[PDB]
From Swiss-Prot:
The lineage of its organism: Eukaryota, Metazoa, Chordata, Craniata, Vertebrata. The chain holds residues 1316 to 1434 of 1821 of the full protein. Expressed in myeloma and epidermoid carcinoma cell lines. It is found in: Nucleus. It is linked to Chung-Jansen syndrome: An autosomal dominant disorder characterized by developmental delay, intellectual disability, autistic features, anxiety, hypotonia, obesity, and dysmorphic features. The modification Phosphoserine is found at residue 90. It comes from the Eukaryota. The gene is PHIP. This is PH-interacting protein. The modification Phosphothreonine is found at residue 44.
Length: 119
C-alpha cells in the first residue's frame, strides 16, 4: 500500500525500455531534419527521454500520467507510419506490448494503495 512506490517502478521499467533495441527510434524527440513533415501529422511529440526527465523532475503525480505519455509515443508512431509493415512501426508494437505487460502491476498497485489510503 506504498503510494510512492510507482516512481522507482517506473524508473526501472524505463531502464529496461532503454536496454531494448526496439526503443532506439523512440529514445529522443524526432529530428525534423530527417522527417520534415513530422509536425504536419503529429501535434504532440513524445519520446522516452522526455518521459524519464518528466519523472526525474517530479512532474508526474501518478503512473497514469506517465502511462498516457508513453502511450502517446506509440500512437504518434502509428499515426506517422506510411505502412503497418514499417520497421519502426513494428518496433513500436513490440515495445508497446512489453510496456503494457510491465505497467499493468504498477497501475494496479498504485490505485490499490490510493484506495487503501482513502478507506
Ligand atoms: C539520432 O537520434 C535519433 C533521434 C530520433 C530518432 N527517431 C526518429 O526519427 N523516428 C522516425 C519517425 N518515427 C516513427 O514513429 C515512424 C513510423 C514509421 C516511420 O517512422 C519516430 C522515430 C532516431 F531514430 C534517432
Amino acid at each position: 500500500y506504498d503510494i510512492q512506490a510507482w516512481k522507482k517502478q517506473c524508473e526501472e521499467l524505463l531502464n529496461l525500455i532503454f536496454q531494448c533495441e526496439d526503443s532506439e527510434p523512440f529514445r529522443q524527440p524526432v529530428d525534423l531534419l530527417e522527417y520534415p513533415d513530422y509536425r504536419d501529422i503529429i501535434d504532440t511529440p513524445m519520446d522516452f527521454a522526455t518521459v524519464r526527465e518528466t519523472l526525474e523532475a517530479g512532474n508526474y503525480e501518478s503512473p497514469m500520467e506517465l502511462c498516457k505519455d508513453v502511450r502517446l509515443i506509440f500512437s504518434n508512431s502509428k499515426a506517422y507510419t506510411p505502412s503497418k509493415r514499417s520497421r519502426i512501426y513494428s518496433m513500436s508494437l513490440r515495445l508497446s506490448a512489453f510496456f503494457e505487460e510491465h505497467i499493468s502491476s504498477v497501475l494496479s498497485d498504485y490505485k490499490s494503495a490510493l484506495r487503501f489510503h482513502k478507506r
